[PDB]
Every structure is written in C-alpha cells, then in structure tokens.
Amino acid sequence: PEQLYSTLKNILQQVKNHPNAWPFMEPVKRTEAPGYYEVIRFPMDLKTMSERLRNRYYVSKKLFMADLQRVFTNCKEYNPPESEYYKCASILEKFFFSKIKEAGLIDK
Ligand SMILES: CN1CCC[C@@H](Nc2cnn(C)c(=O)c2Cl)C1
Numbered sequence: 511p512e513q514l515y516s517t518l519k520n521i522l523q524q525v526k527n528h529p530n531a532w533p534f535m536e537p538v539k540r541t542e543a544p545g546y547y548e549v550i551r552f553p554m555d556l557k558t559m560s561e562r563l564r565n566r567y568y569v570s571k572k573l574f575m576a577d578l579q580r581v582f583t584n585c586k587e588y589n590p591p592e593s594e595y596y597k598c599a600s601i602l603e604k605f606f607f608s609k610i611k612e613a614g615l616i617d618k
Contacts, residue, residue, distance in 0.1 A: 511569070518574050521609050522563055525578065526556045528605055530598040534581050543588070550588055554580045571615050578606055 525531060537555045538546050547553065554577050568574040585599035610616060 514569075514571060515566070517613050517615070518563060518568055518571065521574075521606075521613065522556070522559060522578070524609060525602065525606055526560070528602055530601040530605075531556065533585070533595045533598050534602070546588065550584050552580060553584060554578075556581065575610060575615065579603075582606070 526535065534556045536557050538550075538553060540547060559574075559577055559581070562568060562577070563574070582599040582603040585595055586603075589596040589599075
C-alpha cells in the first residue's frame with residue numbers, strides 16, 4: 511500500500527502543479543457552463559481527486575487512473591477542439607500518460 515500511495519501522490523502532485531492544470535483545479539460551476547451537469551454524467555476535477563486520495567479511497571491504481579483520465583475526457587467531449595480548455599486537457603492528458611508509463615502502471 512505504501513509504495514502505491516507514494517506513487518499516486520507524486521503523480522497527482524506533478525499533474526496539479528502543471529501549467530496546463532488550471533482549468534481542472536476546481537469543479538465546473540453550473541453558472542460558467544449551463545447544462546454541463548446534464549450532458550457530462552460523471553464530472554471530475556483535481557480538488558475532488560486530492561480529497562479522495564487524502565481519504566485513502568484509492569487502494570488500487572485503477573480507480574485513480576480512471577478518475578484522472580475522466581477529467582480530461584470530460585473536457586475534450588464537452589468543449590470545442592479550438593478552445594483553451596480542450597487544448598489544456600490534451601497537453602495535460604499526455605503529461606499524465608507519460609507519468610503513469612514512467613511509473614510502470616500500464617497493464618502488462
Ligand atoms: C471553476 N472554473 C475555474 C476556471 C476553469 C473552469 N474549467 C472549466 C469550465 N467549464 N468547462 C466546460 C470545462 O470543461 C472546464 Cl475544464 C472551472
């Protein structure tokens with residue numbers, strides 16, 4: 511557990527401090543995206559992920575990876591490809607992928 515928790519903490523740290531992480535630091539507000547919570551069925555953001563991680567809710571890598579991936583896929587499904595949010599999501603998603611591959615967390 512201690513090795514996994516250490517790895518996941520470092521990953522989320524690097525992701526949340528990335529220059530393209532800013533759109534994902536807090537949950538999407540209804541007022542800023544009317545209808546978001548109708549069309550995006552499972553919202554996720556990095557504050558929520560930090561709360562879940564700190565609460566020791568991620569006893570497997572799989573939940574953590576799925577939640578973090580969904581931050582980016584939600585963004586890239588909702589927003590226009592030419593939007594800054596979409597572009598940030600694409601960049602940060604690639605960073606995320608590099609971090610999980612670096613840690614040996616991809617399925618063998
Ligand atoms: C709370 N708010 C702070 C600024 C950035 C924003 N991020 C959004 C907003 N709307 N939508 C639709 C998004 O996809 C994102 Cl990432 C979230």
